[PDB]
C-alpha cells in the first residue's frame, strides 16, 4: 500500500492536471475529486485529462 | 465534494508565487488537495517561503 503523502504518482498527476491549458474548471475539479476517490487511478485519470485537453485544443 | 471555486483560487495562488520552485509548488498543491480546509494556513506558509526566497 502507498500512502498519499508518499505517492509521487498522485502528486505529479494533481500538479500536471492543474496546469493543463484546455480543460475547464469543472473538468479539473472533477479530476481532483476522482483522484481523491481512488488514488490508484492517478495514471488513468492523468491520461484521460491529457486526452481531453488535446481534444479541446482551440486549433 | 471539497474541490470547488475556492480550491481553484488557492491552487492558482500557489503556482503564481514567483520565487517558489516546482517541487515546492507541487508539495503545497498536494497539501491543499489533501486538506482544502487548510487553504489559509498553507497559502500564508507558501507566501512566507516565497518571500524568504526572493532575490
Numbering used by the authors:
A (entry chain A): 0 to 58
B (entry chain B): 3 to 57
Direct quotes from the study:
We adopted the Z domain of staphylococcal protein A and its affibody binder dimer complex as a model system. We next generated libraries at the interface of a weakly associating dimer (Z+ ZSPA-1) with micromolar affinity to determine if we could affinity-mature the interface by coevolution. To clarify these inter-residue co-variations discovered from the sequence data, we determined crystal structures of 10 coevolved pairs that spanned a range of cross-reactivities and orthogonalities (5 from LL1 and 5 from LL2). From the structures, we could verify clear compensatory changes between the residues showing the most significant covariations (13A-9B / 17A-31B) in both LL1 and LL2 library mutants.
